[PDB]
Single-chain antibody, 228 residues
Framework: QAVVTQESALTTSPGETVTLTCRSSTGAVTTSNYVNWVQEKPDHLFTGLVYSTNSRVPGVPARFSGSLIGDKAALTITGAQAEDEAIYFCTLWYSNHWVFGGGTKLTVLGQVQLQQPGAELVKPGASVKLSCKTSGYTFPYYWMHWVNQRPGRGLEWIGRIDPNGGGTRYSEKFKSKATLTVDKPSNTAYMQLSSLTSEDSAVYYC???????????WGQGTALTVSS
């Protein structure tokens, strides 16, 4: 329902400081929105940088820091590097669903694995079960989220599953379309999509998380094409 707005693009130079912001259409961003910041490199390489406003994901360089500034959330890069040229997304929580910002292309002048099939091709009307095989961590200690991205459109949160208890939570838009399950013996999360139409053509990502700590590691996505 809400709309999350980021700068279209920004340009910085190595060694400089750059600030990206994340705005909520409903009012000020508070810590109750649990903003996460995720970085997209080419070849569908998403990595989480900050979770829950200000916590840095372990292993992320110290030059990344998250905070609140005025009514907005902010990602500050102090001493930017050429490798920081990428697209930066923020996510906000609204009581029961995540909403993605539109992303900021940052131009710079000058172990845990989530394995997804690269693509799928099915005729309309079919059902499919996408997979996400994990390694490098103990599977049932983390939730698994699913996110999709339609061509020319933004990231949209589908839902999550907790492998231990089994509990799921879905975005209203996807309740009739998607069902999340796990197979713990093989460290695999599944998402079943039913009665596919051409509007279901998109890249579908699995992304790791746990309570208060979401979107740190990502699969590379399954590009699903529905066509007759």
């Amino acid at each position: 329902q809400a709309v999350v707005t980021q700068e279209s693009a920004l340009t910085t130079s190595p060694g400089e400081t750059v600030t990206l912001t994340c705005r909520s259409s409903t009012g000020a961003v508070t810590t109750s929105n649990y903003v996460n910041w995720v970085q997209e490199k080419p070849d569908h390489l998403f990595t989480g940088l900050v979770y829950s406003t200000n916590s840095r994901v372990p292993g992320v360089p110290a030059r990344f820091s998250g905070s609140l500034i005025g009514d907005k959330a902010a990602l500050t890069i102090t001493g930017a590097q050429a490798e920081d040229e990428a697209i930066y997304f923020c996510t906000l929580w609204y009581s029961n669903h995540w909403v993605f910002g539109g992303g900021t292309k940052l131009t710079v002048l000058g172990q845990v694995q989530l394995q997804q099939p690269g693509a799928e091709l099915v005729k309309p009307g079919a059902s499919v079960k996408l997979s996400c095989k994990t390694s490098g961590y103990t599977f049932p200690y983390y939730w698994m989220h699913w996110v999709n991205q339609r061509p020319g459109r933004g990231l949209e949160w589908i839902g999550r599953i907790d492998p231990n208890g089994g509990g799921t939570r879905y975005s209203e838009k996807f309740k009739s379309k998607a069902t999340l399950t796990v197979d713990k013996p093989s460290n695999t999360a599944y998402m079943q999509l039913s009665s596919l139409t051409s509007e279901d053509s998109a890249v579908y990502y699995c992304a790791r998380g746990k309570l208060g700590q979401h979107f740190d590691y990502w699969g590379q996505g399954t590009a699903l094409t529905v066509s007759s």
